[PDB]
Amino acid sequence: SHGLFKKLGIPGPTPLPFLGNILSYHKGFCMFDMECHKKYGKVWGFYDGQQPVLAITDPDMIKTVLVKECYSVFTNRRPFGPVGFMKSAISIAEDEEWKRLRSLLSPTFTSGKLKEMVPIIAQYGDVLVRNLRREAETGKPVTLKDVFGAYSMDVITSTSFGVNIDSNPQDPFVENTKKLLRFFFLSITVFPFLIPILEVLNICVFPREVTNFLRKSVKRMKESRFLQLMIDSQNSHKALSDLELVAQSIIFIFAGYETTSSVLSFIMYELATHPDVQQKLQEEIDAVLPNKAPPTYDTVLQMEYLDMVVNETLRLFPIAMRLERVCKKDVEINGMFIPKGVVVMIPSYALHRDPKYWTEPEKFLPERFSKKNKDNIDPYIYTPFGSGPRNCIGMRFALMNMKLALIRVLQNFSFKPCKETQIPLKLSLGGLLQPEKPVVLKVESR
Ligand SMILES: CC[C@H]1OC(=O)[C@H](C)[C@@H](O[C@H]2C[C@@](C)(OC)[C@@H](O)[C@H](C)O2)[C@H](C)[C@@H](O[C@@H]2O[C@H](C)C[C@H](N(C)C)[C@H]2O)[C@](C)(O)C[C@@H](C)C(=O)[C@H](C)[C@@H](O)[C@]1(C)O
Ligand code: HEM
């Protein structure tokens, strides 16, 4: 079983009997991918405990798994139990049930329905520059994740649950959300055979107290009246449960919160270490919005450079680090055989820094994304939101949301690196991609 990749002739780091290669994860997922890439080349295999994982690297082979053979063979992500009623959530859902849930949720993510939402999101822009200005008054350097955390939290909770929070007020609905996001898992990887053993017991990774509260909180709101567009949905190929509704709303918190605020801390870090880029971006804002005008959907999508800054940050810091897809059946793909059961992984972080596709990959250069160079960028090497039918269904919201907050904060302030800033940046050698040390900067009002 640990002889699968050898048998098939695929190089890979050698596994220990039960742990597979999980002890190599001590250096973080990113450096693990980078080293394997540089060492084993185009394709490599390893083991998360017992699970064969096959990393792939060819834009062609990637297109086949992420777009072409999506519905037929590479439909699902790694299973993860035990999840109870959350198996109804779109990111957890598998096969035809996922197909159905995805179809029912598209209409909720169109640009337009999103344009109809920028106002809701704009409220929280003010709230963010205020908290930011308050910390700037003090005269001391700012830990940005306090405010970007709060901002990301507020935008995501608002849009998914109705409630309109200024968290400031940090003991109503906020406290359940905090308790939901941050929760054994080491063990689950060694023994996926222990997952069925736990689901029988009704043991679930999402805490029942909170889910209940959240389940109630939507029943109340559904009565006293993304949430709306899902209500819209329940009136009219397929149906859509009340329990499935709340499940998508919880999932939106999980997907939108930490990714968004992480990206903002990174984006801010780079503008601060690259003053001529911050300068040019503020120059752009001041041209499209003459004197601190309210940001608009139609306005944002007219901002060339900003889109290049956001994209180049995601190139160097793709929060999900990898894309995964389970292989349903024996497949021959662009002249390579993949057996059923294997997890095919796309190493986004590593591919984003491959000297074959990017010149000087370590350096931050928004130019890569300029009108000139952009059309040679491979859409299967650059994947901060994944690709195909099972890509990030909230990609467009997230970009709009980040940009909104970027806009408001940037026209009002300016960012120098101070004393306690990390130079150069260290990355969280742990979970989802994050600065290893909270980003701290000097925030002067302009
Ligand atoms: C951004 C895009 C998405 O990210 C991912 O899928 C990556 C690739 C996973 O890493 C996968 C894949 C892999 C290989 O890492 C890349 C693996 O090592 C881990 C265990 O799971 C994450 C984070 C998972 O792990 C869990 O996230 C919790 C917040 C912390 C928890 N743990 C650390 C306490 C961990 O189990 C998990 C289950 O998918 C989170 C659930 C809630 C989701 O469905 C959410 C909404 C996601 O779809 C997502 C955030 O949008
Ligand atoms: C920087 C911000 C964000 C990033 C980088 C991001 C990234 C991702 C990535 C990489 C995936 C996996 C794609 C793949 O596997 O091919 C994904 C899936 C998903 N994302 Fe996001 N996301 C962000 C914000 C959001 C927001 C704000 C929402 C909700 C509005 C959201 C909702 C979802 C959902 C529901 C899925 C699973 C889709 C499916 O399984 O069909 N994301 N996201």
Swiss-Prot record:
Changing residue 187 to P: In allele CYP3A4*2; exhibits a lower intrinsic clearance toward nifedipine. Its EC number is 1.14.14.1, 1.14.14.56, 1.14.14.73, 1.14.14.55. One of its GO terms (cellular component) is endoplasmic reticulum membrane. It comes from Homo sapiens. Expressed in prostate and liver. According to some authors, it is not expressed in brain. According to others, weak levels of expression are measured in some brain locations. Also expressed in epithelium of the small intestine and large intestine, bile duct, nasal mucosa, kidney, adrenal cortex, epithelium of the gastric mucosa with intestinal metaplasia, gallbladder, intercalated ducts of the pancreas, chief cells of the parathyroid and the corpus luteum of the ovary (at protein level). Pathway: Steroid hormone biosynthesis; Cofactor metabolism; retinol metabolism; Steroid metabolism; cholesterol metabolism; Lipid metabolism; fatty acid metabolism. Interacts with PGRMC1; the interaction requires PGRMC1 homodimerization. Its cofactor is heme. This is Cytochrome P450 3A4. Its main location: endoplasmic reticulum.
